[PDB]
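Re: the multi-chain job from yesterday

Posting the exact lines I submitted so nobody has to dig through the queue logs.
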Amino acid sequence: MSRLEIYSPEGLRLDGRRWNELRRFESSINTHPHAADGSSYMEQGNNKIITLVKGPKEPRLKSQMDTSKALLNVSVNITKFSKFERSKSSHKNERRVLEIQTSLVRMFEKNVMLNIYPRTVIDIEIHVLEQDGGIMGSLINGITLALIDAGISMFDYISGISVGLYDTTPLLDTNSLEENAMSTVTLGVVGKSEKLSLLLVEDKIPLDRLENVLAIGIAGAHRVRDLMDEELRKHAQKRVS
Amino acid sequence: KDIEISASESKFILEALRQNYRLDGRSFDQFRDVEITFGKEFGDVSVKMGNTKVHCRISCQIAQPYEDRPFEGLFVISTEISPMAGSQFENGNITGEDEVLCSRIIEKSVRRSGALDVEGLCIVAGSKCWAVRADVHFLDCDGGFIDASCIAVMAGLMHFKKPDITVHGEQIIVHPVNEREPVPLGILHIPICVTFSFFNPQDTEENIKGETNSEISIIDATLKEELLRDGVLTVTLNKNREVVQVSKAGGLPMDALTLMKCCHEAYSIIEKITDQILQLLKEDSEKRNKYAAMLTSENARE
Amino acid sequence: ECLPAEGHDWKAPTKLDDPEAVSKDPLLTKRKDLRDKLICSIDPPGCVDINDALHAKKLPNGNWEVGVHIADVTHFVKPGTALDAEGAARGTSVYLVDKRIDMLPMLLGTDLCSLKPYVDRFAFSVIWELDDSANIVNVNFMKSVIRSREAFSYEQAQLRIDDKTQNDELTMGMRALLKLSVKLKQKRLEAGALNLASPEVKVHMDDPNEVEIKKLLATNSLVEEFMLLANISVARKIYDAFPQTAMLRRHAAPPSTNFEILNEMLNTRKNMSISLESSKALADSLDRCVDPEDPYFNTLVRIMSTRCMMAAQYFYSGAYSYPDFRHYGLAVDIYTHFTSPIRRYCDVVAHRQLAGAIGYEPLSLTHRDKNKMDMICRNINRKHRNAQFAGRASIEYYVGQVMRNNESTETGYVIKVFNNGIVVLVPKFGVEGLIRLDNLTEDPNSAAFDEVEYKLTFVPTNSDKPRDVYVFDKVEVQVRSVMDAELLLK
Amino acid sequence: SVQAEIGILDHVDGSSEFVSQDTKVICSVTGPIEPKARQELPTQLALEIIVRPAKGVATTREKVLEDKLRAVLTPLITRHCYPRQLCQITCQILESGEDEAEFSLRELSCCINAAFLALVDAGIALNSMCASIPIAIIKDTSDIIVDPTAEQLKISLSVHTLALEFVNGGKVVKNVLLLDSNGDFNEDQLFSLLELGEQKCQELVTNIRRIIQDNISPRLVV
RNA sequence: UUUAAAA
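And the result, structure tokens for all chains:
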């Protein structure tokens, strides 16, 4: 937009929220019962992510097959119309995207019980229809809710939260305008614990401030877990009855 | 086409770690001694820490700036691993997860974190700028790939000198290297990478919902310690107490207290490696400028 | 590689007729052995670049043997070498306050070329033969070897001349150089020369300490007159042998436009006028523009009239006629620079041309080309103004550091008035200061500016009586540290 | 005078580093090892030659550099005694020592020597020995000079990279392995440099033999 | 587009 106030002395951010408030969280389960065994339409703020889980099934070729566990594939596709300005580049084979795809596989191959499904492959297909800051964390929450829909055994929830540091004030769930004005940290908390399966810091942060940012980060991630959990309670109860 | 590890060797190294023993004889928090070998031309740096040997080559050229940032210069880097450092690296596989994660970590440490003065690399806004390229050559692999490569690039940029340019309104004349002395690049901070390897003597189940943290963390693992590694962490700090970048994805889910402890342990390491590069660059400058005391023009009076 | 291989161990040959010395320097035979002359040096304290060296010896016919000796820089800086081109682009040494950009490496400007005492040094000597009235009888130029007996400073040479128990041949030679300088200066003032003042002030370090005004001594005019006489004598000689490409310096006459606004301020507020019919009339008029109450006011007119003076210029004789060689400030038909080759590059070219006139070494073709000489003169002229503006800014910076780090009250004179600002010149610090109207009064809306009387009426801060401030007013200024370094008015 | 070190890498069968003037090339040899499907040869040994420049990626300039180096090492190795096997020979040029865009003769001369040295340390069957030198002619005197510097190439009319093969104590020349030339020359100057290049490579293998003996002998029975 | 002198 223009030159906005990031965090006014009145504690209000550019979009109206406060320092410890999250964007609206509206998740959806089983949105593609005809295209994949797992489905999750993640709508965290303006972000709109479609996550599909095709598997566990036989691999298309017997070349790559682990006879003691499963193969976890993640396909993150950022559409050209993800932002306001239509992307001119290719995005698919981008080096920044391959880092995200790999970071997601490592994150879940330790949490997903690949041993229960030997000699199989689990394909995860992601399509980002719109992004607005904190896209990494929303990618996390989408995969979690999409595997559960597919009936894949997991040890716990994996929550994705994004935290920014503006001067001396942490900010939960940073949007695009906030990421372009401060440092950003995306966390990957496991359940109600403090175990971090992901820790990405891509901008300079003072060491004396990182610990407090992590504490407020994992605290908001637990809040993200409950919103996903309450979505599964409502989906399971209305489905049985 | 991959390294075969015997069950006997795998069990021995894990139990040795449970007794505070490493095959090479270091400690759990001892970084390998780093050695910097400067080549002939500027930007030719060879880094040797342990048996891992890496070589970096710095270059630059005139290129068009980005349309969204016309006041900044470009920074290119590509780390293609050849079978020279080991026959397990298939040549031509530029999309390898190790090569991908290495470039993205150094690119965040140098370019995104503001180590290289990109604004000083601007000649004319939105038309002409410097595109500094960092070619990293992996010579001998023994763990600590992104640790040594980050030391090589940072030692290379501080040792490299760009050609001099005089702006006459809209024209740009690149002065030959023999005509004018090249100008060194501007470096704001010195990002130094320190990796952490994690092991669990238990299992995955006792680690997800287990309060008792029995993890074993070692600083700068070797190749054999890396192949038996469970979780991996990479932090990057500078002497200004600032966290340049952090990359931890997968492996053992660790807690916040141990990750904060890794940074404070890594700061004492990067603080010493920083002063070594500043000292070894000072000694290499006096090697080339032996009679530099007589050629000084700006001299004090009385 | 262009420097001598001996480095700091370079020594002048004790025997100029030595067969081994003349094998490395065949031009040594064309060099005089003036090492028997009692030569001394008088330079400011803390000097490193010793360019000049004077001596005096009474001749048996009632005259004096006065001779200045200049550092033979051209024996080391040869044309066409990388050492020459590196000094030609610098033009002159820039003298700041803490640092000092040198035109030549310190091997030459400090040790080998500098006329250091007690050591044999190469020099380009100019020997005269003055009478009791300081009249030149015959002049001779030659490259020689000298050994400086001493190296006094201005404050040290003054004590040795004023002392009466030190009566030796070297001290008595300094006595003659004092009585001959005042006779050379008197005949110049009668010929139309100018005597302008300048706030020459310096500071001390440990880190700015304090601002101290520099004092003049009788020995300052001693060296000054013989440096002028040397430059004049060498000017006529290099022009007599190279009238097409002689390195000279001129000074055009100040137009009536420059002294227009200055005379209007002196006539409408002080009823004084500076004569412009001749250079002598300008000097004689400044001596009468003195205020009875303020003795410094006479020097203030000399400072403000210095800005009205035209800028001197380096040039080659092949671009002008002889009546255009006039130097307005010195009132001499021709002039050049020769007595400072370590500092200015103009003296480097003058030394090469003077050596060719005597027959020491043939002048290089780079100093016989009008095109090459023209481009050299435009560079050493641009490098001359840059050096002066840099020296004034370095003094202004370190003085400005004393303003914020040392709060005090000093007296200053105004030199210009505006509708919303007053410029004040302080003799204690030797720098000008602007006092804006917002930082001078509380209500700037109730002010009036009279352009015919050069006054600005306002209501001072913490005062209900409006004050009328004119030009050339002796006021007391203050300094504050109001920052979120500011001068006010008392 | 050139410098050379053998056995510098720990994860390859054979390593070497050839330094001449300003050009520095590190080579790595690993074999015999299991080849791939498209690489295995039914009767003889397969070669995987890969050279890399100091700056930038491996463009088509280094592709012809691999094909010429391949023709030098292929007849030098007894390939028939390693059936269905592979040997990786990677050459990494640390410093070019010339102009990469205008010249490429000094790097070929150092890659040949560095590869032969690494083939000796790895213990591969070699029928003979090898030596390569760069040769150019200054347009001023029009005479033949070996190992010309970087400034001597820009004034050269034609460049040459002669690779020879020596037997019987590094004296008898069995065959001329490679003689790559580009520029302006005639038949009179061809044998004028070929005769001069044969005696400059003879003292090279004599210098190579001394180097590869000061390092292999201490590792054996000593 | 600040004279002269030693720096």
